[PDB]
Amino acid sequence: LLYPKLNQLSNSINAAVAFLLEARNLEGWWQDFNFPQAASIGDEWVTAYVGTMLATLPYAHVHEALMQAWELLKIRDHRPTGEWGYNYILCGDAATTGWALQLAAAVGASDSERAQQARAALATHLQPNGGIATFAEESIRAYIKVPDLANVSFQGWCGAHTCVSAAVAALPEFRSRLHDYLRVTQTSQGNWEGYWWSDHEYTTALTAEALAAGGQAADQPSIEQAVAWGLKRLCPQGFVATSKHPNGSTFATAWCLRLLLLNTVDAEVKAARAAAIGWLLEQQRPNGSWVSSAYLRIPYPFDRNPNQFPHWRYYKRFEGSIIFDHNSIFTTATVVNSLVKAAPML
Ligand SMILES: CC1(C)CCC[C@@]2(C)[C@@H]3CC[C@@]4(C)c5c(C(=O)O)cc(O)c(O)c5C[C@@H]4[C@@]3(C)CC[C@H]12
């Protein structure tokens, strides 16, 4: 163990936590992403995700910030299903609701009336193939009023989504029901592919974590296949390269680092994690943040497989475009979660 590197990991994590706590708005929300024409900036979703990312820190002031985040979410009680969504003006969705329920668990509110209502609402999104859809068709169709899209298929936006299913499978109440869908959607390469996210490391890490949490020995080979895929994705320099970031994506690398935590015995895996930690430490900005790289696709509503859509515009309407986390809060929270989880295994 190189104690200077252990200490820099502490200093890096602390700088990022300070960035994130200072980056809250006057009411205490984390905000990120922007649809400038009308939907504006994410809050409920971002807050649920960031709070969940910070939930493994031991700091009492961070637990207080998560308690506050949960109180903010409970005041967002305007939707009749009890779901949360991108922000106040959007309809509920399963992915935001799943992250909010993970935050609830971290602050001891899993058994609350609101958490029970929101879990029930998730059941409505279960599909005949055993996965979870992000949106109810009639709820999201209301936001698309342009003649050219108002009457197209919504079976892309309203079909089962692996990235959403993987996040909901973090909830013990759903893990068993989603198991078979998670198993059948694994590729021959050992990864999963998401719907909304560009970076397959997100879906792959969350899916492998849900299979690990279930503890079934039948799922361990699948988890090891995913870890092997992660090892291939991480280059020797310690990053995951993408077409957009051929010198490394901080968001993809962080999720890859999380995935590699699912094998604690293999020497090559431990060395790869150490390499990823080194690279992430080098990439941190002076203010504690990492550069935005959480790329969110807006497929056309009819698109059942955005992983087969060959021409995204980095953001005119937004269908066929990619947006990102302009505040770097989403990316930074992802990175600091991966570093906090990996540090004890350095
Ligand atoms: C990616 C996700 C789910 C994130 C949570 C928000 C959500 C629902 C979007 C809300 C804003 C929308 C209706 C919009 C707007 C807008 O209202 O500002 C302007 C557009 O030109 C445009 O194509 C669109 C399409 C957008 C989504 C429907 C696409 C999907 C997206």
Pocket test for ligand 1, best of 134, 143, 195, 322 (most atoms within 8 A of CB): 143
Pocket test for ligand 1, best of 43, 318, 319, 324 (most atoms within 8 A of CB): 318
Return the bridge partners of 32, or none.
42
Return the residue matching tokens 């106040």: 88
Instruction: Please say whether the beta carbons of 158 and 134 come within 8 A.
Output: yes
What is residue 92's DSSP assignment? B
Nearest-atom index, ligand 1, CA of 38:
18
| Pairing, β 313-314 against β 40-42 | unpaired
CB count within 10 Å of CB 126 equals 19
CA 205 to chain centre: 10
Instruction: Please say whether the beta carbons of 176 and 194 come within 8 A.
Output: no
- Identity at 302, one-letter amino acid code: F
Tokens standing for residue 264? 């604690």
Strand, coil or helix: 59: coil
Task: Please give the Cα distance from 155 to 241 (Å, whole number).
Answer: 31
Q: How many domains does the chain have?
A: 1
Domain that holds residue 116: 3-345
Task: Please give the Cα distance from 62 to 59 (Å, whole number).
Answer: 5
* Residue 112 backbone dihedrals phi, psi, to 5 degrees: -70, 155
Ligand 1 near 35 CB (within 6 A):
yes
CA 256 to chain centre: 12
Task: Please give the Cα distance from 91 to 106 (Å, whole number).
Answer: 25
Task: Please give the Cα distance from 43 to 176 (Å, whole number).
Answer: 30
User: Among 303, 335, 300, which residue's Cα sits nearest to residue 320?
Assistant: 300
Ligand 1 near 295 CB (within 6 A):
no
- Identity at 104, one-letter amino acid code: A
Measured at the CA of 291, the angle between CA 247 and CA 325, to 5 degrees, comes to: 120
Strand, coil or helix: 190: coil
Task: Please give the Cα distance from 90 to 257 (Å, whole number).
Answer: 32
Ligand 1 near 39 CB (within 6 A):
yes
DSSP run (H or E) holding 334: helix 329-342
Q: Provide DSSP, 119-174.
A: HHHHHHTB-TTS-BBS--HHHHHTT--SHHHHTS--TTTTSB-HHHHHHHTTSHHH
| CATH for 242 | 1.50.10.20
DSSP run (H or E) holding 32: strand 32-35
* Residue 278 backbone dihedrals phi, psi, to 5 degrees: -55, -45
Cα separations (Å) of 311 from 152, 193, 288?
Answer: 20, 17, 33
Task: Please give the Cα distance from 131 to 116 (Å, whole number).
Answer: 20
- Solving technique for this entry? X-ray
* Residue 93 backbone dihedrals phi, psi, to 5 degrees: -150, 155
